[PDB]
Design a binder for this molecule. Structure first.
Ligand SMILES: Nc1nc2c(ncn2[C@@H]2O[C@H](COP(=O)(O)O)[C@@H](O)[C@H]2O)c(=O)[nH]1
Ligand SMILES: Nc1nc2c(ncn2[C@@H]2O[C@H](COP(=O)(O)O)[C@@H](O)[C@H]2O)c(=O)[nH]1
Ligand SMILES: Nc1nc2c(ncn2[C@@H]2O[C@H](COP(=O)(O)O)[C@@H](O)[C@H]2O)c(=O)[nH]1
Ligand SMILES: Nc1nc2c(ncn2[C@@H]2O[C@H](COP(=O)(O)O)[C@@H](O)[C@H]2O)c(=O)[nH]1
Ligand SMILES: Nc1nc2c(ncn2[C@@H]2O[C@H](COP(=O)(O)O)[C@@H](O)[C@H]2O)c(=O)[nH]1
Ligand SMILES: Nc1nc2c(ncn2[C@@H]2O[C@H](COP(=O)(O)O)[C@@H](O)[C@H]2O)c(=O)[nH]1
Ligand SMILES: Nc1nc2c(ncn2[C@@H]2O[C@H](COP(=O)(O)O)[C@@H](O)[C@H]2O)c(=O)[nH]1
Ligand SMILES: Nc1nc2c(ncn2[C@@H]2O[C@H](COP(=O)(O)O)[C@@H](O)[C@H]2O)c(=O)[nH]1
Ligand SMILES: Nc1nc2c(ncn2[C@@H]2O[C@H](COP(=O)(O)O)[C@@H](O)[C@H]2O)c(=O)[nH]1
Ligand SMILES: Nc1nc2c(ncn2[C@@H]2O[C@H](COP(=O)(O)O)[C@@H](O)[C@H]2O)c(=O)[nH]1
Ligand SMILES: Nc1nc2c(ncn2[C@@H]2O[C@H](COP(=O)(O)O)[C@@H](O)[C@H]2O)c(=O)[nH]1
Ligand SMILES: Nc1nc2c(ncn2[C@@H]2O[C@H](COP(=O)(O)O)[C@@H](O)[C@H]2O)c(=O)[nH]1
Ligand SMILES: Nc1nc2c(ncn2[C@@H]2O[C@H](COP(=O)(O)O)[C@@H](O)[C@H]2O)c(=O)[nH]1
Ligand SMILES: Nc1nc2c(ncn2[C@@H]2O[C@H](COP(=O)(O)O)[C@@H](O)[C@H]2O)c(=O)[nH]1
Ligand SMILES: [Mn+2]
Ligand SMILES: [Mn+2]
Ligand SMILES: [Mn+2]
Ligand SMILES: [Mn+2]
Ligand SMILES: [Mn+2]
Ligand SMILES: [Mn+2]
Ligand SMILES: [Mn+2]
Ligand SMILES: [Mn+2]
Ligand SMILES: [Mn+2]
Ligand SMILES: [Mn+2]
Ligand SMILES: [Mn+2]
Ligand SMILES: [Mn+2]
Ligand SMILES: [Mn+2]
Ligand SMILES: [Mn+2]
Ligand SMILES: [Mn+2]
Ligand SMILES: [Mn+2]
Lengths: 206, 205, 205, 205, 205, 205, 204, 204
């Protein structure tokens, strides 16, 4: 039922992305961007479809996707964008700077819990069950499995719906300016990770 | 060292027609909702300081607050995350043009893990800071001679630290990093007052 | 089970001419200064419950508060240290005649280390409590049916729990120990509100 | 520094016709069921102390127990949680009109995490307590002058500490908080004797 | 299979003219000075068990205590450090001829770090031990059938386990190691009663 | 699945005229000085395995040791650090041409933190490895068929794992890193036997 | 006064006594890797014998005869270690022992510091230096400081035992201490056999 | 006597030898963020060469020739770090090395302290100060205390190595030590490739 377009290297064009907000996710060979290459970028406009883009080893360029990432009129939605921003900026040399993060939004609104993972959020906010089984798999394979392609699409298909709910909660609890300042700093927090401070809360006393 | 002591507020801003002011606070503790602001310290960088005693329940300090709100004047702190919280909580205005020597030390002094004011004054200025008066009753009606000297010393050197740290930030090409951190710092302090003082808001968990 | 849902307050105290009332609350979190009171639940012990939706900024609940301040009525909680704090912070009245089933469990169920409401209901009543709705948006304008049944079942069994624990407290000759703990509990909750929520005030360090 | 040394008990109560007495104890250790009470120290706050050696197997000390039972005389301890347990356990009498300087320190000295007797005596009185004789044989038939002086120095200043803490509790409006903690402290000590010494009875877990 | 429930004591020792007896206990908790002995379980190894309810304050159990003090009869426990301590504390007799399957397992089942009774019965005997009833009210006047069957299952297999462990201890030539551990075990339980329960008396620190 | 069981040694090397042999061991535990080698398992990668019971006190295994010493045959292990140590300790010969799938996994499966053989077989081969017989009595005279099948399953897949891991090592350009780790692996195992088993010899501290 | 010997005692003339204070120096805390280098003995008369042990030495007949003597109590501070390395080097496990650390843990219940330095400072007002503890004890020639540190760890063990024995009698723990000392050689054997990281009596 | 240079050794006249002592100073412990600032060399003759490395410098031909010479053993204390930052900066990973920290971990089994200061104090009775360690090593002009501190960290490595070789021989661990030194360049490569927080041989 869910249409998933799979691409090699880049989007063919931006026909599906003349929109004000785009959901973004990535798959990699690990959590360390200097060691673990970008393997997949996922995108959704919010219409129930997704694009899954395989990134080859040593790929330096993805003009259409990077046009989206640098377009200040388009908000990039992420879940825990701290990671996705870092590997994207590392790979293509462009740090997106108009972002919304559903993990940060959750930490500022779902104050009645300590579990802010995407699976827990989708279940509670949308009654949608996400599987994390394919997360630890070989994302650098020449041909992605059906299950990998569906996992990868599942991580962007719901971010618009989550963002809409979190914005209502941020308004209801009067934390919009707080959230906005956090989103403003998130790209620099990702840059700090790339520069060597990934283990350091830079605002902590010690 | 000339240390001018005041009750409630500065009498005027004659000593503060400057581009940056060093700011510090003493309190009854680390929890601003429980522990009242007790002293505000200022220095223009000229070797003198103003020590201002804040009374219990004091809601206003118009001259000092005009300094704190002046977007043309950078406020210099050491670990301003705490000072910004108690100042905004007490007088109702969050300064938003700031420089923090602790964030700056964490961005430049990468060869150490000690970023306290005493360690920094030692290494960068060969100045020895005493911290013995930090745990004392700062809400006392009359501050002791040693409290007043301690309270002054915490702002006397911040201008010199800033100038060194700015040189190192430039040398290592980290100016835009530090600027971005200083920009978020007031909101980081706000997040402390709102209830997130135990949470790294950017951590995975 | 019959569950009466109200906006703002009980309509009257016709169901609560009793010596003990079961009380519980739902909030937006564990930090009363940030996380508002959203729901208050009551039960007389007869299998029925009242679920009271508390609006944002609501300052009074005259009928509910009459019960909380009525010294002829014992208020039964599970971990009242929390409910007492958010009730007192929201409506300005700290209940002072209380029974806490968690303290009672810690004083009687010495053969275990789990003292949660779910474990206690399973062991003493063979009642299966579900905690799935605990993490939900309790500030929603319309509560879900799942939410309303969860909120109610957290008070339906406290009378039966209290009766069992009172027998255990008598068997093990610890009534006076428990009474003294119950008498301090309001002050323990007060201490949380004042800033000592992370401090065991009686510990050595 | 006048220190009267007695065996078994006070010879009489002539130095203790007062409304508050400073009390301390020395033991073979921290576990009252294994480690016997060895020394009981008293001071009226006049700069003298009575050090009372307690014998192995001793079940009574009538003059001391008359003081501890007297509802008209406040007993002042530093960390009376422990002293109350070992005295109630040895002589059968739990004092219930008490003042504890450690609890008072935690309620007032919010600018610090150090609440030992040494740190308090230094900051509030400029008095230097030595802790060297703390680990020594307090059951020794004959106590060294070092031991006798240590034992008396733990009661000589509690009156002066109390007065200062009373002024802080008044300044910060925590008088009724401190009172309620002092009221529960005997039960906190009873709880320790009954087997809950490792349990904060009010903790969630 | 056949479980015999007695009040207070065995009626006689007709079933216990044997060389070794499996012993187990149920209590109100892990702290013998606070948590009373409630049930004692015995088996001869013939597939039947005796389950003896011990009343509150019961000082005497003459047929049971005859077994405990009989130097010709090995008492078999699983983690007898605990059962020994509560029996000695309750009836005043410390058994000194013991075999512990948990110590034997730590000395023979070197290929694993799990040494509880459940995992040992599964591996050595393919017997499934349910631990659901471990946390129940063992001081209840009438014990449930589940309770009685759980309490008997903890002695029905200790003879079989002892035989297998003795074979493994002989295979690996550790018989004299185990014998000395069993000689010391009643003193290790005594050390717990005396106040050293948290202390490895043979550790460096 | 054909499994050949042998007492003492392989009858001959007819099935092992190959470039690489999968190797695994079963012991009485993780401490070679205490825990004797019990079983050695081999596979050529053809879907069959040989399982070799090693007797207590056995000092030679000529044909197996001939494979272990042959520099033209690569020995494949999962976590060979352990297997190399116990084979060297038992038969006095440390193999030196090895491939290890745990080290391989740590150098290629950077997208996970679980590098156990069960998890690797699951993800790379869709083969379900049961670890239930792991904690069993490997010194028994007669091994159960479940034990023999467990023992053979730990060598039946190591060839297929090796091939996949070699493709990953080439794709990520870590062949020479892996090779230096394997070259050092026998000395890492010697270090374990000599007494450094708990020390990372390259760590700062 | 400190007598330094090679390999063994010349005779047992100084050791016709009830109790001997015993101590060792090694290359570390692992007896299977770290060899026995020195053995120190005192009779309690304020003198000591320091016995350099050679690499590969398998016997020391006069010392071993002391360690074997059921009539002579061997006194240690933390004999768990010394018994292990003596048994592992010479094949004989002493079985008549007294350990001041266990004694201290059973009597000095007002403290958590049971090191030999604290016990000496408190019970004897004697200051023990530990500087030479980490030094090359396999050196062919031991320094004067090394030789005195070696001796100082046995010169006081008789005085400590007598104090502890009074504390044990005062608190009625004589039979508790005796059973601990009874088990202690086996606790040492358990260390030798592979259980050195395991409290054998713990629940887990 | 300490010779201070900019960028590189002028020539190799003082280093026609078998073993050179090597050390580095940096802006921190992360080679990808914290640049190499100083390289220190000593021939063991009581003198030292202190070389200041400029920001962005990619070559130092005379120094790199020493590091590449298989006939010259490079001596380090905790070479795992120095090898990483040298290979990252100049592109050459030295492969004939000796590490006094690894050797201390293989010989000084009677202690758990293996820092350079602690080792220099016990084996040479030389007192090292770590006060200048936390300082701005990227300064255009190094202070006198910085230059002296930088030199002192190479001045004694030759003497430490001789003592450790005697210990390794006495305890029969020469081959064990040689294999650790052989792997050490790969241990440092592993760090640069992203495994600096992982013991690659641990079970988990
Ligand atoms: N090592 C490790 N990597 C993870 C873990 N979770 C996610 N990753 C890596 O991070 C990438 C993004 O995670 P995802 O967006 O699938 O949750 C994955 O493709 C995987 O490489 C984890 O728990 N451990
Ligand atoms: N940087 C970082 N990202 C993580 C970690 N664990 C999971 N992630 C990332 O966080 C997202 C999913 O985390 P979740 O919030 O769902 O637990 C994915 O982007 C995944 O790669 C981690 O430990 N560090
Ligand atoms: N952060 C957090 N909040 C909780 C947790 N459990 C309960 N709460 C909050 O505390 C309130 C107490 O309600 P109850 O636990 O009785 O449902 C809940 O409504 C919820 O807001 C928890 O585990 N973590
Ligand atoms: N202070 C605190 N309260 C909790 C926590 N988790 C649950 N609670 C509260 O404790 C009560 C029931 O907890 P339970 O004992 O059932 O686990 C509810 O009021 C619930 O909100 C916690 O982690 N901390
Ligand atoms: N075990 C132990 N007992 C202590 C410690 N500190 C004090 N004690 C015991 O507690 C008694 C009273 O303590 P004080 O009033 O001297 O602080 C002392 O005589 C001593 O028996 C300690 O740190 N450990
Ligand atoms: N429960 C407990 N009491 C202590 C401890 N240390 C000292 N005490 C008791 O506390 C008092 C002295 O504590 P301090 O002077 O450190 O505040 C004495 O009464 C002493 O017995 C400890 O570690 N635990
Ligand atoms: N507090 C506590 N007590 C236990 C626990 N397990 C067993 N007990 C107590 O110890 C007694 C003996 O345990 P059992 O022989 O049933 O395993 C039980 O009757 C019960 O009172 C536990 O995990 N926690
Ligand atoms: N010290 C201690 N004893 C326990 C604990 N749990 C159970 N016990 C006691 O020791 C026995 C251990 O049983 P296991 O867990 O080995 O099957 C129980 O029967 C009970 O008597 C525990 O956590 N600590
Ligand atoms: N002590 C201990 N030994 C284990 C454990 N797992 C495996 N072993 C031992 O190590 C041997 C080899 O492990 P395997 O190859 O079966 O995974 C087993 O035969 C067993 O003796 C464990 O978790 N703990
Ligand atoms: N050093 C060590 N080895 C282990 C441990 N657990 C299992 N092993 C060994 O590692 C192998 C099992 O590896 P796994 O399947 O857990 O990756 C077997 O050879 C087993 O003996 C452990 O905790 N520590
Ligand atoms: N690794 C290490 N070994 C020690 C330590 N303390 C003592 N030793 C070793 O244990 C031996 C016991 O002798 P003593 O410590 O009484 O001088 C010493 O000779 C020394 O080899 C320590 O802290 N660490
Ligand atoms: N397990 C252990 N034993 C030590 C340690 N330090 C010293 N020892 C042993 O304990 C003896 C002295 O004990 P201490 O005086 O340190 O309490 C030494 O001779 C040595 O055998 C240590 O850190 N750990
Ligand atoms: N962050 C941090 N860096 C250190 C520390 N010690 C040394 N460094 C860095 O590592 C370099 C190594 O030089 P050394 O420590 O040999 O003087 C130093 O120049 C310094 O940059 C430390 O404790 N913390
Ligand atoms: N990982 C780590 N390395 C250090 C630390 N301090 C110093 N180092 C590194 O280790 C080298 C030697 O340190 P040392 O062994 O003297 O303590 C230094 O030159 C520096 O490169 C530290 O705290 N942690
Ligand atoms: Mn992601
Ligand atoms: Mn994803
Ligand atoms: Mn400040
Ligand atoms: Mn200050
Ligand atoms: Mn609740
Ligand atoms: Mn509830
Ligand atoms: Mn005291
Ligand atoms: Mn005292
Ligand atoms: Mn049991
Ligand atoms: Mn049982
Ligand atoms: Mn294996
Ligand atoms: Mn296996
Ligand atoms: Mn020793
Ligand atoms: Mn010694
Ligand atoms: Mn260095
Ligand atoms: Mn250096």
């Amino acid at each position: 039922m869910t249409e998933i377009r799979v691409h090699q290297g880049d989007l063919p064009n931006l026909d599906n992305y003349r929109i004000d907000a785009v959901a973004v996710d990535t798959e990699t060979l690990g959590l360390q961007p200097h060691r673990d290459r970008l393997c997949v970028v996922q995108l959704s406009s919010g219409d129930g479809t997704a694009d899954v883009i395989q990134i080859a080893k040593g790929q330096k360029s993805a003009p259409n996707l990077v046009r989206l990432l640098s377009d200040r009129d388009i908000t990039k939605i992420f879940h825990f964008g701290r990671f996705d921003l870092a590997i994207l900026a590392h790979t293509f040399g462009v740090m997106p700077d108009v972002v919304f993060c559903t993990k940060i939004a959750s930490k500022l609104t779902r104050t009645y819990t300590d579990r802010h993972g995407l699976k827990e959020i989708c279940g509670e906010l949308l009654n949608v069950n996400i599987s994390k089984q394919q997360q630890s798999s070989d994302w650098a394979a020449e041909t992605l499995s059906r299950a990998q392609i569906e996992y990868a699409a599942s991580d962007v298909l719901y971010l618009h719906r989550l963002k809409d709910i979190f914005e209502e909660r941020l308004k209801r609890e009067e934390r919009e300016s707080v959230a906005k300042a956090c989103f403003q700093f998130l790209p620099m927090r990702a840059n700090l990770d790339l520069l060597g401070w990934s283990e350091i809360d830079i605002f902590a006393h010690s």
